[PDB]
């Protein structure tokens, strides 16, 4: 799994060999930075497809760079700041901050393919999951599932197929199969890493971290999409 160690020994050696105030671009052209991204990419399981391994690598990149430039990340304030985002690209959030809702967001092949998986808000943890939330008192489980992904994963989605209620341990899970409409450049938990992987790779990576409920939902929603 995770390693907050390398995050600290990266920012000590990156502070050292680099001019103070070093650019986003400056840290990247650095030679040791690429060596580290290599290091963690090994930790992912084998058999991961080419286009998936690429997709993850960009995420580690995002992680290490965000960690260098903005530090570590608390849970109350997961916003990574951005200049140069036309308002069309920013999630429209003036927010307010067991049962479980849970999404399988599909993107059109036109737009790229696969299904959204995201990082936990503990970004020194190397954990990729489905967008999953709980419900507010009185909230229809679909209005909740929509609300959660626009926040944790910053994507406007619209329901394809309701996958219905199922039971893991003490908890009832209601799952959806969804269509992304708009993907926002800036959303309220920007620090997290968004990856869109193919159906067979998502299954692999979620089983890799013992997320056995989410493998069944993915298998579930997968055959539903195929059904059309």
- Would you state the structure tokens that stand for residue 154, as one six-digit string? 């910053």
Distance CA 122, CA 119 (A): 8
Please tell me the distance from the alpha carbon of residue 113 to that of residue 109, in angstroms, as a whole number. 4
Task: Tell me how far apart the alpha carbons of residues 195 and 56 are, in angstroms, rounded to a whole number.
Answer: 6
To one decimal place, what's the resolution in Å? Answer: 3.2
Could you give the dihedral angle defined by the CA atoms of residues 7, 55, 197 and 211, in that order, rounded to the nearest 10 degrees?
-10
Cβ-count burial 173-206 (b if 16+ within 10 Å, e if not): bbbbbbebeebbebbbbbbbbbbbbbbebbbbbb
Going by DSSP bridges, is the β-strand pair 155-168/171-183 parallel, antiparallel, or unpaired?
antiparallel
Contacts of 156 (CB under 8 A, 6+ apart): 150, 180, 181, 182, 183, 184
Rg of the chain taking only CA atoms, in angstroms: 18
Assigned CATH for 87-227: 3.90.79.10
Which residue shows structure tokens 């969804």? 178
The DSSP bridge pattern shows strands 171-183 and 99-106 to be parallel
Look at residues 146, 135, 160, 158 and name the one whose alpha carbon lies nearest to residue 93: 146
**Domains of the chain, residue spans:** 5-70, 87-227
- Tell me the torsion sign for CA atoms 63, 211, 201, 148: negative
- The angle subtended at Cα 161 by Cα 198 and Cα 204, nearest 5°, is 25
Q: Return the residue matching tokens 């938990």.
A: 189
Residue 34 CA to its chain's centroid (Å): 21
* Secondary structure of the chain in HEC code, one letter for each residue: CCCCHHHHHHHHHHHHCCCCCCCHHHHHHCHHHHHHHHHHHCCCCCCCCHHHHHHHHHHHHHHHHHHHHHCCCCCCCCCCCCCCCCHHHECCCCCCCCEEEEEEEECCCCCCCCEEEEECCCCCCCCEECCEECCCCCCCHHHHHHHHHHHHCCEEEEEEEEEEEEEECCEEEEEEEEEEEEECCECCCCCCCEEEECHHHHHHHHHCCCCHHHHHHHHHHHHHHHHC
Q: Which two tokens stand for residue 185?
A: 């450049």
For residue 18 the two structure tokens come to: 């680099």
How far from 30 is each of 23, 24, 33, 106, 192, CA to CA, in Å? 11, 11, 6, 36, 23
Place of tokens 């999409």: 225
Distance CA 136, CA 96 (A): 11
């Amino acid at each position: 799994v995770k390693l907050e160690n390398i995050l600290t020994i990266f920012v000590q050696r990156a502070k050292a060999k680099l001019p103070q105030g070093f650019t986003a671009a400056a840290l990247g052209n650095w030679k040791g930075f690429s060596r580290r991204v290599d290091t963690v990419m090994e930790h992912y399981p084998k058999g991961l497809s080419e286009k998936a391994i690429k997709e993850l690598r960009t995420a580690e990149t995002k992680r290490f760079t965000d960690y260098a430039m903005l530090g570590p990340s608390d849970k109350y304030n997961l916003l990574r700041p951005m200049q140069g985002v036309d308002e069309a690209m920013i999630a429209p959030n003036l927010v307010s901050l067991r049962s479980v809702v849970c999404n399988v967001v599909m993107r059109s092949e036109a737009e790229g393919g696969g299904i959204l998986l995201i990082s936990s808000s503990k970004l020194d943890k190397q954990d990729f999951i489905l967008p999953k939330g709980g419900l507010e008192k009185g909230e229809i489980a679909y209005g909740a599932a929509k609300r959660e992904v626009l926040e944790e994963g910053g994507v406007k989605v619209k329901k394809l197929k309701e996958l219905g209620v199922t039971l893991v341990g003490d908890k009832t899970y209601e799952s959806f199969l969804m269509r992304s409409k708009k993907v926002y450049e800036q959303w309220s938990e920007s620090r997290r890493l968004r990856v869109w992987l193919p159906w067979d790779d998502a299954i692999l990576l979620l089983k890799a971290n013992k997320h056995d409920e989410m493998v069944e939902i993915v298998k579930q929603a997968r055959a539903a999409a195929a059904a059309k």
